[PDB]
């Protein structure tokens, strides 16, 4: 298939990016360090909310470092106009780049949360291996989905621009807006209104931010204290169950990938 | 003098940089937004403004001048400019004048609207103390920016490609702002038997971000030693940049 033949390139091109392997080893040496501090203090709801905050800062960062120059990095490099004269479509050199960069994020977090689990089962004596495999299995198949959102965000902001220097400004703008501005805009809207703006609409604004849907999935069972949540204490007021929160994370992929394909179809 | 004829280029080229004007606007809003929450909610707000200009004035200086030498070598104009009646000293010092007056203006839009938000929202601020504490603030924020300007000329002349210049410009910003003081705290809270804490006021002089805060927080040395140590960080690193630029 042609979707795999161009996925095999990006799997062998993203792994030679030295800027990726710096901040993917930084994801590995911090997830061991958080899980070691979570082992010496024993607690359990504090080492889950800190790992989910660690992957909030880094799994959008590895996704936007990969794919900000996926379309516009090939357009000004000349090899995009060449690729359309090969037996391909615009839907195959985008979904193929999504499969190729998606297996890197599926491997950058299997390295990261894989050694984080081995720094718990070999550190915390008498831990429940069934509870460890289930909690860190929920971390693996949902930090990819957060990574695949910002991967699909980067194809939107690469097809729209026509210069790679302006794509790096938008990819830094999307990383700043969704991670640590929307968490601060929602905080400043709650502080300055003292919680009396809207008592029913404000928990639904967490679904307009995929880093907040990511944090609400992993903090489902291990709630614990309220200050470990912070802004995410609004998530107890959400009447939706846990299964739709998986589906709103997949809908953030599929809407922002069909938008990524409709932009690229009129490139 | 041809040190000014190449300085008028860098004013006209630096003020049209889209990356600089985004950060310099973000520097001027946050200097108002700290002054908004420090007057309605003056040494308490000039210390929080010092922590702001320690974050962004190294970042503004490294965004201007990381591609000053190696960005011209990749563009080919550096090889063209040496065949003109121009020494290698006048290109570097003329870029330092041209990039220097940009962030000497970026603190006048940065703190010119921050001191306006203090002098018009306290109503009795006693502005004779304001124009000497902010006059010492705008001068010392330019000299901090001129260090990281001269730091950017050192790493630009050493590298051969524009991609590895930004990899070093990010590394100097991490090391001199928030890695040197984190290893100062780790030398305190983890070592106490072989770390004299009286020695630590002299190691604050090895960091131009640290000397920047010490002349906005007024200590075994006087004030005048710290002004002559901040200017020594400019004059050594510019002489180091001139020694690197003569070996291309």
């Amino acid at each position: 298939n042609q979707v795999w033949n161009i996925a095999r390139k990006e799997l062998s091109d993203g792994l030679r990016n030295r800027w990726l392997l710096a901040i993917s080893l930084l994801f590995a040496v911090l997830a061991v360090g958080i899980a070691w501090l979570g082992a010496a203090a024993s607690s359990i709801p504090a080492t889950i909310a800190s790992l989910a905050s660690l992957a909030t800062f880094l799994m959008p960062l590895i996704a936007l470092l990969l794919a900000y120059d996926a379309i516009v990095g090939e357009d000004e490099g000349g090899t995009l106009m060449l690729l359309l004269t090969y037996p391909l479509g615009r839907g195959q050199i985008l979904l193929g780049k999504f499969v190729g960069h998606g297996l890197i994020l599926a491997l950058a977090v299997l390295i990261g949360f894989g050694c984080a689990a081995l720094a718990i089962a070999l550190l915390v004596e008498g831990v429940e291996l069934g509870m460890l495999f289930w909690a860190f299995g929920r971390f693996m198949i949902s930090s990819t989905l957060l990574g695949w959102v910002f991967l699909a965000f980067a194809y939107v902001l690469s097809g729209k621009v026509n210069e790679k220097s302006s794509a790096a400004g938008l990819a830094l703008g999307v990383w700043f807006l969704f991670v640590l501005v929307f968490d601060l805009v929602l905080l400043a809207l709650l502080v300055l209104s003292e919680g009396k703006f809207n008592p029913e609409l404000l928990p639904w604004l967490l679904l307009l931010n995929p880093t907040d849907i990511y944090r609400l999935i992993n903090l489902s069972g291990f709630e614990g204290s309220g200050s470990a949540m912070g802004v995410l204490s609004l998530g107890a007021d959400l009447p939706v169950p846990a299964a739709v929160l998986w589906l709103c994370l997949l809908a953030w992929i599929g809407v922002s990938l069909l938008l990524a394909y409709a932009i690229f179809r009129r490139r | 003098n041809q040190v000014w004829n190449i300085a008028r280029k860098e004013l006209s080229d630096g003020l049209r940089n889209r990356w600089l004007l985004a950060i310099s606007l973000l520097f001027a809003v946050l200097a108002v937004g700290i002054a908004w929450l420090g007057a309605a909610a003056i040494p308490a707000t000039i210390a929080s403004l010092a922590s702001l200009a320690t974050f962004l004035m190294p970042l503004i200086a490294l965004l201007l001048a990381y591609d000053a030498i190696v960005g011209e070598d990749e563009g080919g104009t550096l090889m063209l400019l040496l065949t003109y009646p121009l020494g290698r000293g006048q290109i570097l010092l003329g870029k330092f004048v041209g990039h220097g007056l940009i962030l000497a203006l970026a603190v006048l839009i940065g703190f010119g609207c921050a001191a306006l938000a203090i002098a018009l929202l306290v109503e009795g601020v006693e502005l004779g103390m304001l124009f000497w504490a902010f006059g010492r603030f705008m001068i010392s924020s330019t000299l901090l920016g001129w260090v990281f300007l001269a730091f950017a000329y050192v790493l630009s002349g050493k590298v051969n490609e524009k991609s590895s210049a930004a990899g070093l410009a990010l590394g100097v910003w991490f090391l001199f702002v928030l890695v040197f003081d984190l290893v100062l705290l780790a030398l305190l809270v983890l070592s106490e038997g072989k770390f004299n804490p009286e020695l630590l006021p002299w190691l604050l002089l090895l960091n131009p971000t640290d000397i920047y805060r010490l002349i906005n927080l007024s200590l075994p040395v006087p004030a005048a030693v710290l002004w002559l140590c901040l200017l020594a960080w400019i004059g050594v690193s510019l002489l180091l940049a001139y020694a690197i630029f003569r070996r291309r």
Partner: protein, 298 residues
């Protein structure tokens, strides 16, 4: 009959940037498109590749549709400037393009030696020169026996030993039966290797045909210059007897502007009486023919 463009008048933005070009290309010829870098030449280049839709007209590449996958395995496109993938190697870039076009993987090791790039194989493309990337750009164009090359300036940034060897590689493929289109701007030198030129200007295809036809359909003076002649005083007049102006520009740079209507009587005068030193029948080159047809259009 490889490329049969008929009646195409491409409109975009209601501007009509191409108009009514009837460009039939034979099955062994080497055509040359010689417009500017504006919307006349590069629009007709995108029509043959199939990545543009011909409004009001039909483009038939190899007897079929231009965007079919069965004919797009038989094309080869060398673009203008392709800094390909700086972190990939030389073999892995060409094996990537071999998997996409359906070519056999045994062609990659015998194309990195056919093009002079076996010393730089398994080395990264960031360590390549501009000429070495044009060598790599040619290597994916000859991938899997293409029946239609389409080279858009293949000899820029390239040494003249490799440039002369590239046109011999072009002349090997012309005898094999593969039509080549040379969209170029390095017009001195390309006139020895093309079969038919196609000068298009302001959208309208002005002139097409071989080099013998473009000199026949356009009266141009042959420019004989004899630098370093033995005798010069009688050579100002003995050629001017049939209306050929003995115009000079230096101490001895007499560029006699002839009329191309009296070629019998000047050579029987020269070889019947008097010994020559260096006769120079200088045909009207591709710069002078292009400067006539572009001037005729405006």
């Amino acid at each position: 009959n490889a490329v049969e463009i008929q009646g195409v008048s491409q409109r975009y933005g209601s501007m009509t940037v191409l108009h009514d070009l009837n460009l039939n290309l034979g099955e062994g010829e080497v055509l040359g498109l010689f417009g500017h870098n504006g919307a006349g030449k590069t629009t007709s280049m995108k029509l043959i590749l199939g990545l543009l839709s011909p409004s009001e007209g039909q483009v038939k590449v190899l007897g079929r549709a231009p965007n079919d996958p069965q004919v797009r395995r038989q094309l080869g496109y060398l673009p203008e400037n392709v800094t390909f993938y700086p972190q990939l190697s030389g073999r892995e870039t060409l094996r990537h393009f071999a998997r996409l076009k359906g070519a056999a993987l045994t062609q990659v090791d015998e194309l990195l030696e056919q093009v002079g790039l076996a010393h730089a194989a398994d080395r990264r493309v960031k360590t390549y020169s501009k000429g070495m990337r044009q060598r790599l750009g040619l290597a994916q164009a000859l991938l899997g026996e293409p029946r239609l090359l389409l080279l858009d300036e293949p000899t820029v940034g390239l040494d003249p030993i490799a440039t002369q060897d590239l046109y011999l590689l072009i002349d090997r493929l012309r005898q094999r039966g593969t039509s080549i289109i040379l969209c170029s701007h390095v017009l001195p030198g390309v006139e020895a290797h093309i079969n038919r030129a196609a000068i298009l200007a302001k959208g309208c295809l002005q002139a097409v045909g071989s080099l013998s036809q473009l000199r026949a359909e356009a009266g141009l003076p042959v420019r004989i210059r004899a630098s370093g002649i033995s005798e010069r005083d009688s050579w100002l007049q003995r050629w001017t007897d049939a209306g050929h102006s003995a115009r000079g520009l230096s101490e001895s740079s007499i560029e006699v502007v002839a009329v191309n209507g009296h070629k019998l009587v000047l050579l029987r005068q020269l070889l019947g009486e008097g010994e020559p030193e260096d006769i120079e029948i200088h045909q009207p080159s591709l710069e002078d023919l292009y400067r006539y047809y572009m001037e005729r259009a405006g």
